Design an enzyme around this catalytic site. Structure first.
Site, PDB file in Angstrom:
ATOM      1  N   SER A 231       0.898  -3.895   8.165  1.00  0.00           N
ATOM      2  CA  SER A 231       0.214  -3.551   7.055  1.00  0.00           C
ATOM      3  C   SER A 231      -0.855  -2.710   7.588  1.00  0.00           C
ATOM      4  O   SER A 231      -1.382  -1.550   6.911  1.00  0.00           O
ATOM      5  CB  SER A 231      -0.619  -4.887   6.359  1.00  0.00           C
ATOM      6  OG  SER A 231      -1.798  -4.640   5.585  1.00  0.00           O
TER       7      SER A 231
ATOM      8  N   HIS B 148       0.867  -1.207   0.033  1.00  0.00           N
ATOM      9  CA  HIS B 148       0.098   0.049   0.027  1.00  0.00           C
ATOM     10  C   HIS B 148       1.024   1.278  -0.125  1.00  0.00           C
ATOM     11  O   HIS B 148       0.290   2.295  -0.554  1.00  0.00           O
ATOM     12  CB  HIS B 148      -1.213   0.056   0.997  1.00  0.00           C
ATOM     13  CG  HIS B 148      -0.522   0.340   2.526  1.00  0.00           C
ATOM     14  ND1 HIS B 148      -0.516  -0.933   3.105  1.00  0.00           N
ATOM     15  CD2 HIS B 148       0.068   1.318   3.008  1.00  0.00           C
ATOM     16  CE1 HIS B 148      -0.040  -0.400   4.322  1.00  0.00           C
ATOM     17  NE2 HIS B 148       0.293   0.984   4.400  1.00  0.00           N
TER      18      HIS B 148
ATOM     19  N   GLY C 181       2.334   5.788   9.860  1.00  0.00           N
ATOM     20  CA  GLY C 181       3.652   6.075   9.636  1.00  0.00           C
ATOM     21  C   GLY C 181       4.317   4.639   9.825  1.00  0.00           C
ATOM     22  O   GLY C 181       5.807   4.598   9.340  1.00  0.00           O
TER      23      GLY C 181
ATOM     24  N   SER D  76       3.605   1.627   8.743  1.00  0.00           N
ATOM     25  CA  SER D  76       3.113   0.957   7.604  1.00  0.00           C
ATOM     26  C   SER D  76       4.510   0.290   7.023  1.00  0.00           C
ATOM     27  O   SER D  76       5.625   0.973   6.970  1.00  0.00           O
ATOM     28  CB  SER D  76       2.604   1.340   6.338  1.00  0.00           C
ATOM     29  OG  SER D  76       1.235   1.133   6.861  1.00  0.00           O
TER      30      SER D  76
ATOM     31  N   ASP E 279       0.127  -7.588   0.795  1.00  0.00           N
ATOM     32  CA  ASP E 279       0.539  -6.191   1.008  1.00  0.00           C
ATOM     33  C   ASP E 279       1.886  -6.453   1.035  1.00  0.00           C
ATOM     34  O   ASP E 279       2.434  -6.083   2.067  1.00  0.00           O
ATOM     35  CB  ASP E 279      -0.453  -5.881   2.383  1.00  0.00           C
ATOM     36  CG  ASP E 279      -0.207  -4.354   2.621  1.00  0.00           C
ATOM     37  OD1 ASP E 279       0.532  -3.595   1.585  1.00  0.00           O
ATOM     38  OD2 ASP E 279      -0.851  -3.868   3.308  1.00  0.00           O
TER      39      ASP E 279
END
EC number: 3.4.21.81
Lengths: 185, 51
Positions: A156, A33, A139, A141, A63
């Site tokens: 994720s 993402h 932040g 991720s 992801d």
């Protein structure tokens, strides 16, 4: 730069998951993402230190994404913050794990479920995810989930927060490694 | 930003901040919109970017 450190694209900030390589080519994994629609990545908010360019991206469904390093001098440490990573492993229910991200730093917890489906809406559904009781915030991720010197997943998404407690889902890192033919070091 | 399809049970965790009327920086639109729902529609967007 190492796992958990901030990464910036044209649109926002994520965290570096793990530094990986294939032959002599270095890359880093992060969340799909974050790689979706990003081309260049930098090491700082000023965008003055380039890291490299997106080489692959898989989101939704999975992801994960991978960025190929174009910066020749930046140190590419095979660690997570200072922690060495030596291998990758499959998550199991009850496993103690640790996450590191660019907003909240390092937090620990355990794997509570496998193969979870997470629906982020608008048709963005991801499958096969690891569920844990570790918190995470925006932040974080793409940062690493590891267990000792074992790489386990990439952050994720989830809910809750670090103050009150939360649930975070991670993409199994083994799948990404396999897809890209790369390995941790 | 339209929070109509909220709430959502999970959000991704990229950082692209928004500034709420409560003077709190919300890390992304999904986090901001879940908070609007949680406040029963009283929280609004003050501006884009950090507060």
């Amino acid at each position: 730069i190492s796992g958990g450190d901030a990464i910036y694209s044209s649109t926002g900030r994520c965290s570096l998951g793990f530094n990986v390589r294939s032959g002599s080519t270095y890359y880093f994994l992060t969340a799909g993402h974050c790689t979706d629609g990003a081309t260049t990545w930098w090491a700082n908010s000023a965008r003055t230190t380039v890291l490299g360019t997106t080489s692959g991206s898989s989101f939704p469904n999975n992801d994960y994404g991978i960025v190929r390093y174009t910066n020749t001098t930046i140190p590419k440490d095979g660690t997570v913050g200072g922690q060495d990573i030596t291998s990758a492993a499959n998550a199991t229910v009850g496993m103690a794990v640790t996450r590191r991200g660019s907003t909240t730093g390092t937090h620990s917890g355990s794997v509570t479920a496998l193969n979870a489906t997470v629906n982020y809406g608008g048709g963005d559904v991801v499958y096969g995810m690891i569920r844990t009781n570790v918190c995470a915030e925006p932040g974080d991720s793409g940062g690493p989930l590891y267990s000792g010197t074992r790489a386990i997943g990439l952050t994720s998404g989830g809910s809750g927060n670090c103050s009150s407690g939360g649930t975070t889902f991670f993409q199994p890192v083994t799948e990404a490694l396999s897809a890209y033919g790369v390995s941790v070091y | 930003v339209d929070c109509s399809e909220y709430p959502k049970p999970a959000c991704t965790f990229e950082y692209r901040p928004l500034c709420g009327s409560d003077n709190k920086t919300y890390g992304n639109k999904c986090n901001f919109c879940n908070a609007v729902v949680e406040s029963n529609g009283t929280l609004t967007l003050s501006h884009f970017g950090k507060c």
